[PDB]
């Protein structure tokens, strides 16, 4: 009928006092066309899910902010979700920005000043909410330059909010690319 | 050091008395220059490895992989040549293509098998922290610019990347991850050598 659905994972905050590790490195990045680097409803951070082989499963993250739920295009390319007992429908989305929005427009606004050490609210599958403080790094690339988060983990966390010292979401977890070591490097994507 | 590396699970084979299972689709579908579909020293043993980072959370699958005639074969978007430990000693990518969405480490590509056109398959999918299993459906197809593309339809957790499908005489007809979802949101995976 509808495979994916959302379900919640908490309300975001900020962990006070929360445990900090990451390289914060400087680098310079391309971007395909793709999105591609190279060189219901209550407020609160959900799981995207999927029924199926093996049943239940998490394709991703994606937080709802004011009616309108925020993920990233490569998770769901606008499937249907069926969230709480109605569905939940795609209005916009962007696949270069890898974005997309459920039911409105975008509507997160903060965004990553140059100073600030920013939060990973991480929402892994099997896993509970877990926070955690980085030194962003940089994406150098030829016009503007973006927030990057220094973190390696596993697939299906895809769309988990990073944050600012306000508890505001300033972009999103999980595009970006592997150093040669095979480190994980995501970029803030807003 | 090396984060990325890779672990034997087992023996490609066709496995008969096997759970039989999904649909069908003949599709309308068409694939970007960066290999999205769109619609409308270290040890090579034969056999199927799973892929591994070693993160925050320990040690996780990225994905899967092929290994044969000395060379490993997994999908691009898995790993986009990182390298690879294995055993005591590393693999470094040799050969790629993002539009296929391919990669293949110490030596060129050597799965040569393809597509019947006609015959049932079996999907050897062995998705993280589980069983590797042996499925078979009759693949629909992708109809497409360049001709037809078979596909199964099989919904499996993210990280089951790069496993193979194979025919009746257990021959790689081509990996697993590559895919579209139909209106609905179920997965469908191109079967791509
Ligand atoms: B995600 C996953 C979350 C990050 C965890 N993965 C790690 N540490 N290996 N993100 C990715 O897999 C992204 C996916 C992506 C798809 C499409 C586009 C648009 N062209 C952008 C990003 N891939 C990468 O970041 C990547 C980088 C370098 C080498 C390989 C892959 O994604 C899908 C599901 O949610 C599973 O988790
Ligand atoms: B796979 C993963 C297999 C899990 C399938 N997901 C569900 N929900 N059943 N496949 C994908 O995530 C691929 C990733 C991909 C990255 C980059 C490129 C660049 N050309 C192509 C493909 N994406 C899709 O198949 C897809 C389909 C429909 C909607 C969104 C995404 O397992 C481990 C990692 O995720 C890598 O691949």
Redesign the pocket.
Known sequence: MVDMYIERAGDITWEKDAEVTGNSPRLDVALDE?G?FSLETTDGVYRVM?R?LLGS?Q?GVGVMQEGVFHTMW????G?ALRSGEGRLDPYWGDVKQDLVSYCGPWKLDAAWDGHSEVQLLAVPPGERARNIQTLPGIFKTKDGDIGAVALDYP?GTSGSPILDKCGRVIGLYGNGVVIKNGSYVSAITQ
């Open positions: 793709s591609d999927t199926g499963t394709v490569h998770v769901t390319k499937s697939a």
